């Protein structure tokens, strides 16, 4: 948390840039289990990639 930085730059995000940012590839169109209501693995809220609940 510096709060004093000089420049702000924008540019086209290459496939490698996107590839690099991601903490994992979401593989399933699943949001959450319908009974447990907990996030489905490899899905859109998968804790494995996005983070702990």
């Amino acid at each position: 948390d510096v709060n004093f930085f000089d420049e702000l730059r924008i540019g086209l995000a290459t496939a490698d840039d996107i590839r690099n940012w991601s903490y994992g590839e979401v593989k399933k169109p699943e949001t959450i289990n319908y009974r447990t209501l907990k996030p489905e693995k490899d899905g859109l809220f998968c804790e494995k990639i996005f983070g702990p609940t």
């Binding site: 702000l8 730059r9 540019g11 940012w21």
Partner: protein, 116 residues
């Protein structure tokens, strides 16, 4: 007439915050705070009150760590801390990334800075 004081007076020091954005959520339902909109920022900028404007947009609404530290400062009677990065701005950076726009905050050195 159905406009009455008891229903229209609102006051807020601290309270709940939105889940997506970290600003106070308005309305009487949530003990909400008042909105400092686009025109109001123009007036403050016209006055030249940079610190008053920064205070309103960083540690009164969106600074997840700033708003809690200022409360700690007021209770302890200490000076009010230096503001942080508005969560709204950080959310903006992520929303640009999601559009395949590589935005990089840069210092004098030209080195990228981890926004975390």
């Amino acid at each position: 007439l159905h406009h009455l004081v008891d229903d229209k007076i609102h006051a807020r020091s601290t309270g709940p915050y939105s889940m997506i954005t970290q600003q106070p959520l308005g309305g009487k339902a949530q003990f909400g705070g008042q909105r400092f909109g686009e025109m109001e920022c123009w007036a403050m900028q016209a006055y030249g009150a940079a610190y008053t404007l920064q205070e309103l947009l960083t540690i009164k609404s969106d600074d997840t760590v700033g708003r809690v530290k200022v409360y700690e400062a007021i209770v302890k009677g200490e000076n009010i801390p230096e503001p942080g990065i508005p969560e709204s701005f950080k959310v903006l950076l992520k929303e640009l990334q999601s559009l395949c726009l590589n935005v990089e905050v840069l210092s004098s050195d030209g080195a990228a800075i981890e926004m975390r």
